Amino acid sequence: MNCMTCQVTGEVSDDNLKLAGGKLVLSKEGAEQIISEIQNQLQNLK
Amino acid sequence: MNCMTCQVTGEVSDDNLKLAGGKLVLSKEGAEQIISEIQNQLQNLK
Known about the structure:
Two copies of one chain form a homodimer.
Chain A: E1 17-26, H1 28-43
PDB class: transcription
Keywords: AbrB, C-terminus, transcription
Assembly: dimeric
């Protein structure tokens, strides 16, 4: 048996987040704004 | 064609960052740890 858990921290959420692959270019502030979107999706799905 | 720049902020970097994809599962704290890795890749090549 297995479950969706964080490989970097070990936390398990029902709304769980996924690692990057590169659909569009962002800078330092763009990437952190994606993490605002990602952490907001974990907090409540849009 | 055109230069690489942030579509979310408008900033350009020499080691510019890229959007999500879905490569492995993380939680809220794991995804922000990827932000630490991402912003560190941009910051270590200036």
